[PDB]
Structure formats: C-alpha cells, structure tokens
Paper text:
Human monoclonal antibodies (mAbs) against the third variable domain (V3) of the HIV-1 gp120 envelope protein derived from HIV-1 infected individuals display the ability to neutralize primary isolates representing different clades. One Ig gene in particular, VH5-51, was preferentially used by 18 of 51 (35%) anti-V3 mAbs, and is not used by 44 other anti-HIV-1 mAbs specific to the CD4-binding site (CD4bs), CD4 induced antigen (CD4i) and gp41. To test this hypothesis, we analyzed the crystal structure of five Fabs of VH5-51/VL lambda genes encoded anti-V3 mAbs in complex with various V3 peptides. The results confirmed our hypothesis and showed that (a) the shape of the antigen-binding site is similar in the five VH5-51/VL lambda encoded V3 mAbs and is primarily formed by the CDR H1, H2, L1 and L2 domains, (b) the majority of the key contact residues of the mAbs are the same and germline-encoded, and (c) the epitopes of these V3 mAbs have a very similar 3D structure.
The specific epitope shapes within the V3 crown targeted by five VH5-51 derived anti-V3 mAbs were determined by crystal structures of their Fabs in complex with three V3 peptides representing the sequences of MN, NY5 (clade B viruses) and consensus clade A. The following structure complexes were determined: mAb 1006-15/V3MN (1006/MN), mAb 2219/V3MN (2219/MN), mAb 2557/V3NY5 (2557/NY5), mAb 2258/V3MN (2558/MN), and mAb 4025/V3ConA (4025/ConA). Structures of three complexes, 1006/MN, 2219/MN and 2557/NY5, were used previously to analyze the conserved elements of the V3 region, while complexes 2558/MN and 4025/ConA were determined for this study. Of these, seven V3 crown residues at positions P304, P305, P307, P308, P309, P317 and P318 have contacts with all five VH5-51 V3 mAbs, with the largest contact area between 25 Å2 to 100 Å2. There is a slight difference in the superimposition of two peptides, MN and consensus A, in complex with Fab 2558 and 4025, respectively, which have different conformations of their carboxyl terminal end due to different residues interacting with the peptides. The two residues in mAbs 1006-15 and 2219–NL31 and YL32, the three residues in mAbs 2557 –DL30, KL31 and YL32, and the two residues in mAbs 2558 and 4025–KL31 and YL32 which reacted with the V3 peptides, are present in the corresponding germline sequences of lambda light chain genes. Previously we observed that three VH5-51 encoded mAbs (2219, 2557 and 2558) neutralized different numbers of pseudotyped viruses, especially resistant Tier 2 viruses, which might depend on differences in affinity and/or specificity. While all three mAbs share conserved structure of the binding sites, the CDR H3 loops are quite distinct and may contribute to the differences in neutralizing activity.
Author numbering:
A (entry chain H): 1 to 52, 52A, 53 to 82, 82A, 82B, 82C, 83 to 100, 100A, ...
B (entry chain P): 301 to 309, 312 to 320
C (entry chain L): 2 to 9, 11 to 95, 95A, 96 to 106, 106A, 107 to 208
Write the structure that this text describes.
Amino acid sequence: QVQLVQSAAEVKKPGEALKISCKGSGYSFSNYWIAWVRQMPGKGLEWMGIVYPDDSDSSYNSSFQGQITFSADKSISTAYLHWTSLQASDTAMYYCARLGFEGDYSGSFFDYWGQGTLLIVSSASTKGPSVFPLAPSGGTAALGCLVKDYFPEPVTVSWNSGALTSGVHTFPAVLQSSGLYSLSSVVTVPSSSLGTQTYICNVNHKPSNTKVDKKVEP
Amino acid sequence: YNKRKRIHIGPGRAFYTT
Amino acid sequence: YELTQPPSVSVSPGQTASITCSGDILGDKYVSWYQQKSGQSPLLVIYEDTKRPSGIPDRFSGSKSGNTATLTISGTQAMDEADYYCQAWDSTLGVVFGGGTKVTVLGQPKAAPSVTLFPPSSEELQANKATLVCLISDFYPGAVTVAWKADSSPVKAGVETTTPSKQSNNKYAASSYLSLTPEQWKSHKSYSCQVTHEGSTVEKTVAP
Ligand SMILES: *[C@@H]1O[C@H](CO[C@@H]2O[C@@H](C)[C@@H](O)[C@@H](O)[C@@H]2O)[C@@H](O[C@@H]2O[C@H](CO)[C@@H](O)[C@H](O)[C@H]2NC(C)=O)[C@H](O)[C@H]1NC(C)=O
Ligand SMILES: [Ca+2]
C-alpha cells in the first residue's frame, strides 16, 4: 500500500529556517511528483508547488517562489519543503500529496496524501496567561474567565475545582496576530445564586507552570 | 525520455508547463 | 485563484447531495474531487471528471457539463459529512482548487447561535488593555461569519475569530475577540458583535 508520512508538528519563530518532510513508502518514490499544499485553519486548500524526486525538478506557485524551495533525498524516499526565513503568516497545516499517473504520463489528480504537518510561527516564548473575570451583569446569568495571552497550547479550565460541570462551556483558543493565544470559559448559573455562591475558574497552563484559581465576582 | 515528467491535465495534448 | 463551489450543502441521511464546481478552465481540464473530514487529510474520491478510485463507494459520482463539474452523493450517509474540494489544472498557473463545500448530514434541526458578548473587565482596563469577547454557541450546521461594529460602523482591525468546534450536544461553538485600547473603548457609544448563520443574524451590543 502507498503511504506518505510527514514529519511532526513544528513551533518556530519568525526569521528561522525550517524544512518539513514527506516520506513515501510502498512504491517507487523517485518516479511520482509530490505536491505541497497549504491550509490555513478553517480555510481551503492552496497549492504551493510540485517536486519530482528523481531529479529534484520543481515547479512553484509564483506567489510562494522566493519563500520556499523543495528537495528530495532519494536514498530515504523523502521529499522536503524548505523555508529559509519564516513569517507569522506561514502558520498553517501543510500536506504533501502524490500526483497519480495516466497512460504513459503523470496525470492530473492526487491519489495519496500525507497526514499533514501543523506549523505554528510566532515570536512568543513560553508565557503563562493573565486571567480576567467576565462578570455576570434572569433567571440565568453567564459568567466566565478570559484566559489571555499565553503560549504555547494547551490550557485546561475547570470551575469550582471540578465541582461545577453543568452549564460550563470552555471555548477553543484564538491565536492572535500578536503570536499569543487567548481563550474563554463561561458557566451559566441561576441569577439568584450570584449573591451567595462563589464561582472560581481553575486555569492550568503546564508549559509555564501557571496554575491560577480566579474568583469571578458579580 | 522519462514520460512521467509530463503532467497530462485534460484529454488530448493538454499538459501543464513545468 | 479558486474554482467556484457553493459554501455549504445540508442534506438528511438518504437524500442526494449535489455539489457544483465551476471555472472557465474546466471545459477541457480533468476535475478531481477530495473529501476532507474534520481534522483529517483530503482523500481522492473522483478523478478525471467521472472515475472512482478503488475503495470509494458507488454512491459518489462525478459528472461534468461544460465549465461546471458536479459531485453527486446519492443515499448520503452520516459518514459522508465532510468538506469537499474540486480541483483542476491551469496550463501555466498549476493546481487550482475550489473554495470547498461543507456538506453537513443533518442529525438535528438547524439551530441559530446563542451569542454572549462581554465588555472588557475593569481589571483588564486597569492593565491598559481592552478585549471584547463574543462567545457563540449552539449553532448547527457548524459555520458562522462574525462582523463587529463600533457604534454603527464596521470595524475590521483588531478582530480575531476561531474556527468552529463541535460541542458535546453535536452543535458548534466559536468565539471572536476585538482588541481595543481603553481609549477606543470609552470613546464610542457602543460596540456590537453580529453573528450570521445560514443567512440569519444574531446581534449583541455592549457600551462603556
Ligand atoms: C498560488 O498562491 C496564491 C497566493 O496565495 C496567498 O499568498 C500565499 C503566499 C499564502 O499566504 C496564501 O495563503 C494566500 O492566499 C493564491 O492566490 C490567492 O488565492 C486566494 C484564493 O482565491 C485569493 O483570496 C487571494 O487573493 C489570492 N492571492 C493572490 C496574490 O493572487 C493562488 O490561488 C495559488 N494557486 C494558484 C493556482 O495560483
Ligand atoms: Ca451512521
């Protein structure tokens, strides 16, 4: 069976160089073109270019010419996508894909794809979040915590030390143009409990050893 | 010559220019 | 440079989903279609307009009429829910994809989003920052667009919006954040987050 297996997730800084890999097995790797495809989160597939591994011949989308190159190491059936100077907008998922054959020639479709390599490019160093309260302002009130400006993922959030689970909604983070993540978690509660019940969001960011329990007051 | 270097993209003599 | 597909198709299990892809190059170029399930790589499901790879069910068929290719899924099943992309080659510009079509196989009624908009907290304004937080939940199918207003004017700078994510109730959530200086914050009468879903909009507003 044909398999294309790509290298692991990358977290880099702007200006750094990087190469990611796509190793093909189950066929004659040198004989089929490899495409590289970019997909920003939540967006579509965009073609970057193609490389022929037998001779490293490449054809680029000229919008990326000058930021990327391709190469191949035929001895280990692997193709590469290189950048010599990353920028924040290079954050995306990258796939390789094999172009299939038709008749005597290569064809027009990509019949096998890698599993993807996620690239995140940010100037940030490891940083724990600031946690701000999102005060309730019914009979229900939503209150929450804003978990702001942390790096890298992930963060966990619980409420009242895990004692409050119903009506909890913890949202996935946004990666802001600053290079830092933020996320929020909100719990919907009886309006009448606001005077009496204490609500505390427990935020943990293990990369920075940041563990904060923030009280959210009315 | 290596005919797999040519990329055939529609019926007939329709190729991509590499 | 993208071929044109409808952004979204929603069908109940058993019904036919028809996805179109048009572009001026398609009349004499082979069209391929890929299925991309959430969190997974694309998979080829039709190539050379009408051909199916081995292992793809016969309920996927492709056709083409002039500049418009159509992927038809007959007897759609829940496992066919995915984003589907068409593709072809421009002779000199290379591989052109369609914009993608999110095909949802409906397992519950369409649901408009619930929107909760928080103003900046007094703690954050004391730290010389201001973030408006628009939390969007319980919408289905899982796609929304978000627009922000300062008073009544469109604001684009400072906005950052997440992809949608599936909830445990199989509806979806997303969030959008607008970063302002405290002075921008205090200087308008109000700011609003407007979330559009399946052509209908849900708006919330906060004021300093
Ligand atoms: C070739 O690439 C261009 C450029 O893509 C953009 O720039 C890259 C460096 C990267 O940041 C991409 O994610 C950007 O989208 C593609 O042209 C873009 O197409 C999108 C979709 O139609 C459109 O919204 C942008 O305005 C286009 N930008 C430009 C400068 O033309 C293009 O589709 C790629 N593929 C082909 C076949 O050319
Ligand atoms: Ca089923």
